[PDB]
């Protein structure tokens, strides 16, 4: 419902499917405020998996119902509208990185696993741009640091596309993308919306290590949760919804008793 060409303020999910035998994230562009916040989700939080009715960690939750039972999960632990999203391969992600000349990012770290990804400010192409992006052992952080370096990631793709150019050679990327992002909606976006790629900030979803029938589920903390939600829906045009502070906190009850903190 988000009117994109009267550049109202919109949200989108982006999402990195592994077809080959994942990574679920946020963004708010709201250019009213010249600003865009990313918002990782943890694949083991636990939620209402909308659809399925029962509560399960996110990540199963495109598993179960694809990219439909997703969005709306999504919607639900946010409260706020999806009103698009995008799913890409590890092909097409690859394929990106490629397709916009690579991307500068800063190697904290400085793993190498059959691919190696050197240490401090270098360029990354479509090879070393999946390692760099799914890497969750070389890295003392596990999950929060994995998560900042895909935000990263996708932070410079995302400033890389919209710093004026392409767009139609990057289409190569088409045969292993699906969105409800037509082409219009893309070029209202790169006239329109460059402003709300001024600031990119970020958003971190505050929770509790849990586990339940033995397998580790984290337990979102109620009050952190509404103040993100509250925060997000606001990047939205949004007001506050009071109501879902009291949702937030019935749910964390009925889950505490399996905190392990």
Do not use: C
Request: aromatic fraction near 8%; avoid cysteine.
């Amino acid at each position: 419902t988000a009117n994109i060409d009267a550049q109202e303020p919109f949200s989108v999910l982006l999402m990195g499917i592994d077809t080959g035998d994942d990574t679920t994230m946020v963004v708010t562009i709201n250019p009213k405020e010249n600003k865009s916040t990313m918002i990782s989700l943890d694949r083991d939080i636990l939620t209402d998996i909308v659809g399925n009715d029962t509560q399960d960690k996110l990540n199963h939750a495109y598993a179960f119902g694809g990219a439909e039972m997703a969005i709306n999960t999504v919607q639900e632990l946010l409260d706020i509208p999806i009103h698009h999203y995008v799913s890409i391969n590890m092909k097409g992600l690859k394929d990106l990185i490629d397709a916009v000349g690579g991307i500068e990012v800063d190697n904290t770290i400085g793993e190498f696993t059959g691919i190696t990804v050197p240490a401090g400010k270098i360029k990354l192409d479509g090879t070393t741009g999946l390692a760099y992006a799914r890497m969750r052992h070389e890295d003392p952080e596990g999950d929060v640091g994995r998560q900042r370096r895909q935000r990263e990631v996708v932070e410079k793709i995302v400033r890389k596309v919209m710093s004026f150019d392409y767009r139609k050679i990057l289409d190569a990327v088409e045969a292993n993308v699906k969105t409800d992002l037509t082409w219009d909606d893309m070029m209202d976006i790169q006239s329109k919306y460059l402003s709300a790629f001024k600031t990119i900030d970020s958003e971190q979803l505050q929770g509790y290590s849990a586990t339940i029938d033995d397998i580790y589920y984290q337990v979102l903390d109620p009050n952190s949760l509404y103040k993100t939600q509250t925060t997000l829906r606001k990047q939205l045009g949004l007001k506050e919804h009071a109501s879902e502070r009291e949702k937030d906190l019935a749910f964390y009850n009925q889950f505490s008793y399996a905190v392990t903190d």
